[PDB]
Amino acid sequence: TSAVQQKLAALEKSSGGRLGVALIDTADNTQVLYRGDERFPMCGTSKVMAAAAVLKQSETQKQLLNQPVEIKPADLVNYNPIAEKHVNGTMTLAELSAAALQYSDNTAMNKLIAQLGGPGGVTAFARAIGDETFRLDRTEPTLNTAIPGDPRDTTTPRAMAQTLRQLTLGHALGETQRAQLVTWLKGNTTGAASIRAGLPTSWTVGDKTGAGDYGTTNDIAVIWPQGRAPLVLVTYFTQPQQNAESRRDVLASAARIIAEGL
């Protein structure tokens, strides 16, 4: 083990929970992993895959992002900060993507999932871009149950870091679509206390958080550090107690550890 991994292990021990980290340094394509091949509940970090799948569809259906989608009262689930402004109205697939990614809107995520034909459609997109690990099984809000040992709606830190890299820095998406995803992630409103809080303030960050039961506290980020090649960082955290409180500080602390030397 390296000193990086030793520090992450000590953080995990202090936290009481289970921590998963994957860093990809694109300067030399090295990775740093901590429980990198263990499954964790994705919660809302899965919204990146759903939005990306719709972006992929738009590469052959060029006006797809502008398509209005009806929002009915019955569509609302447990956290609908943007969709609730459009009941008996509409949101375009672009608007749904922005709401899901930048405000963690769960109704918006369900519309993305439906556009893809269900959770299986999101998983099929993952497989199509070479993510062999990701699985989406449920809609919102049950995809956040985060039950210990439940493989539903999980991935590994390594797989999600590789995928996020391919989506945002690589070419799993077309050029316009990649840029759009980066724009959405950069404008996220929910990440100030998570990975962003542990990184130098001069670094540019795009991220998507996740939250669920068992105090599950997640964040995945693409990072442009000062004067060096970009990074991808996944920090997944989950706890033994179903009713555990969020621990965004653990993610910030993991980011702080990872940033050393970079």
Dihedral in degrees, nearest 10, Cα atoms 49, 51, 57, 58: -150
Residue 249: which of 71, 14, 4 has the closest Cα?
Answer: 14
Q: To 10 degrees, what angle do helices 47-58 and 119-128 make?
A: 70
Question: ∠ CA(26), CA(32), CA(37), 5° rounding?
Answer: 115
A 10 A CB-CB count for 166 gives: 18
Specify which residues 104 forms β-bridges with. none
Residue 240 tokens read as 């033994």
Resolution in A: 1.2
Specify which residues 223 forms β-bridges with. 205, 231
Strand order in the sheet with 204-212: 30-34, 18-25, 231-238, 216-224, 204-212
For the chain, list the domains and their CATH numbers.
1-262 (3.40.710.10)
Please tell me the distance from the alpha carbon of residue 144 to that of residue 28, in angstroms, as a whole number.
Answer: 35
Please tell me the distance from the alpha carbon of residue 233 to that of residue 238, in angstroms, as a whole number.
Answer: 17
**Cβ–Cβ under 8 Å, residues 55 and 173:** yes
Q: To 10 degrees, what angle do helices 106-115 and 119-128 make?
A: 70
Question: ∠ CA(249), CA(253), CA(257), 5° rounding?
Answer: 170
Specify which residues 237 forms β-bridges with. 19, 217
**Cβ–Cβ under 8 Å, residues 181 and 54:** no
Please tell me the distance from the alpha carbon of residue 257 to that of residue 232, in angstroms, as a whole number.
Answer: 14
* Cα dihedral 153, 56, 171, 210 sign: negative
- For the chain, what is the HEC assignment? CCHHHHHHHHHHHHHCCEEEEEEEECCCCEEEEECCCCCEECHHHHHHHHHHHHHHHHCCCCCHHHCEEEECHHHCCCCCCCHHHHCCEEEEHHHHHHHHHHHCCHHHHHHHHHHCCCHHHHHHHHHHCCCCCCCCCCCCCHHHCCCCCCCCCEECHHHHHHHHHHHHCCCCCCHHHHHHHHHHHHCCCCCCCCHHHHCCCCCEEEEEEEEECCCEEEEEEEEECCCCCCEEEEEEEECCCCCCCCCHHHHHHHHHHHHCCC
Q: Is 1 exposed, middle or buried (0-12, 13-18, 19+ CB in 10 A)?
A: exposed
**Placement of tokens 């519309």 in the chain:** 111
**Placement of tokens 């929970």 in the chain:** 17
Please tell me the distance from the alpha carbon of residue 223 to that of residue 195, in angstroms, as a whole number.
Answer: 10
Specify which residues 218 forms β-bridges with. 210, 236
Q: Is 197 exposed, middle or buried (0-12, 13-18, 19+ CB in 10 A)?
A: middle
Interstrand relation of 18-25 and 40-41 (parallel, antiparallel or unpaired): unpaired
Residue 204 tokens read as 């540019």
Question: ∠ CA(232), CA(238), CA(242), 5° rounding?
Answer: 155
In the chain, the amino acid numbered 78 is N
Residue 220: which of 231, 202, 207, 229 has the closest Cα?
Answer: 207
Q: What are the backbone dihedrals phi and psi of residue 221, each rounded to the nearest 5 degrees, phi first?
A: -145, 145
Determination technique for this PDB entry? Answer: X-ray
